[PDB]
């Protein structure tokens, strides 16, 4: 019957009425890339390629969550210590106002007493519809609430504590109750993380997005999820985020493969591998990460008002995203600006990725651990030194 497809277009010639004309509909018009999500009867896709202004028709691929379960006063999970976050908190817990982290995942238990105060914005992109309603944005799986707690669980007398326990979180639900998500919804969730709550990327028109107090963009997009497919419009959204000054962090994958899933495999994205508490790379961790982090036996928040232990590269990812939030929060607190994102290759202290690379606890890049295990305390020293 009806398939979902993503059309790359020339906006001067693409007439959307041509798709309604063949029994299709417009699902979502991207604001930041020239592309549109459409539903068409499957036997009419051939007619789509043929319309004026249609440059490419791509099918809607599937990505999936990358965390799975391991089988009272406040605990500091072993991974938060390993990554050397508690030492940083006298400088910053990430609570500097221009800083937000967007977590594209299964949603969040937004009224969880260890999370709520840091939940700044809650949205859903599922099924190509942007929803800002609470029932839509709530986590129906648990995995997002877990990823989120590793980043930002409160420092208090309950539960757990995240890497950056003061940072504002934008929860962006791009994955359903089963942890499965379409590339379409994930590209839309990324656009939303750039647009933010006011729906405009660059409201004052000055060319600054991430790190501009006049805007409400996130500064980190964290994606603990992956698929085998490399689609154009998705990689275009990645570049829009990258160009806006957003650091993008994604899980390597859990199939013990030689290279990362997507989007972790894009040059603009920090691929993240998983270690255990013995500083062994997990066997499941996809190889050639950029950096690695705690991803086995990770205790964190879980629905509802509860706590759970999970494992996977999905768990390693938010430790890195939390480190990035500390670097950017410390740098903005001292200077009144953030660092550039940087590249895989980078070994300077002038770039977030540069700092991640050279402060990593290398156990010189390798195909197992990447540059090594991120260390917040040392990264924040490099950023400020
Ligand atoms: Ca911001
Ligand atoms: Ca806590
Ligand atoms: Ca905005
Ligand atoms: Ca601006
Ligand atoms: Ca401005």
Curated annotation (Swiss-Prot):
Localization, UniProt: Secreted
Segments forming domain Peptidase S8: 77-380
Functional pH dependence: Optimum pH is 9.5.
Molecular function, one GO term: serine-type endopeptidase activity
Residues of the propeptide: 1-72
Keywords: Calcium, Hydrolase, Protease, Secreted, Serine protease, Signal, Zymogen
Cofactor: Ca(2+)
Thermal response of activity: Thermostable. Highly active at 80 degrees Celsius.
Enzyme class: hydrolase
Disulfide bonds: none
GO CC terms in record: extracellular region
Active site (catalytic residues): 105 (charge relay system), 143 (charge relay system), 314 (charge relay system)
Ranges annotated as spanning the membrane: none
Gene Ontology terms describing biological process: proteolysis
Alphabetical list of Pfam families matching this protein: Peptidase_S8
Enzyme Commission identifier(s): 3.4.21.-
Family note: Belongs to the peptidase S8 family.
Function statement: Has a broad substrate specificity with a slight preference to large hydrophobic amino acid residues at the P1 position.
Oligomeric and partner information: Monomer.
The protein, known as: Tk-subtilisin
């Amino acid at each position: 019957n009806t398939i979902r497809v993503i059309v790359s277009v020339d906006k001067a010639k693409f007439n959307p009425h041509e798709v309604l004309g063949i029994g299709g509909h417009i699902v979502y018009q991207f604001k930041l890339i020239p592309a549109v999500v459409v539903d068409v009867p499957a036997n009419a896709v051939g007619k789509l390629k043929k319309m004026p202004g249609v440059e490419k028709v791509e099918f809607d691929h599937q990505a999936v969550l990358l965390g799975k379960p391991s089988w009272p006063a406040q605990t500091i999970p072993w991974g938060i210590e390993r990554v050397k976050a508690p030492s940083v908190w006298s400088i910053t817990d990430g609570s500097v106002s221009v800083i937000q982290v967007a977590v594209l995942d299964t949603g969040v238990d937004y009224d969880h007493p260890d999370l709520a105060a840091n939940i700044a914005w809650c949205v859903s992109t599922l099924r190509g519809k942007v929803s800002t309603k609470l029932r839509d944005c709530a986590d129906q799986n648990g995995h997002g609430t877990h990823v989120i707690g590793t980043i930002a669980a409160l420092n208090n007398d309950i539960g757990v504590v995240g890497v950056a326990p003061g940072v504002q979180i934008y929860s962006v639900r791009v994955l359903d109750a089963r942890g499965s998500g379409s590339y379409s919804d994930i590209a839309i969730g990324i656009e939303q993380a750039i647009l933010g709550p006011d729906g405009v990327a660059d409201k004052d028109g000055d060319g600054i997005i991430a790190g501009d107090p006049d805007d409400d963009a996130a500064e980190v997009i964290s994606m603990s999820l992956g698929g085998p497919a490399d689609d154009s419009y998705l990689y275009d959204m990645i570049i829009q985020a990258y160009n806006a000054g957003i650091v993008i962090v994604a899980a390597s994958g859990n199939e013990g493969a030689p290279s990362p899933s997507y989007p972790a495999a894009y040059p603009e994205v920090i691929a993240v591998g998983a270690i255990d508490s013995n500083d062994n790379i997990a066997s499941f961790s996809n190889r050639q990460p950029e950096v690695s982090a705690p991803g086995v036996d990770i205790l964190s928040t879980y629905p509802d008002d509860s706590y759970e232990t999970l494992m996977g590269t999905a768990m390693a990812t938010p430790h890195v995203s939390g480190v990035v939030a500390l670097i950017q929060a410390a740098y903005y607190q001292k200077y009144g600006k953030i660092l550039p994102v940087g590249t895989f290759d980078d070994i300077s202290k002038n770039t977030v990725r540069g700092i991640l690379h050279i402060t990593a606890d290398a156990l010189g890049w390798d195909a197992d651990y990447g540059y090594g295990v991120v260390r917040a305390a040392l990264a924040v020293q490099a950023a400020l030194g």
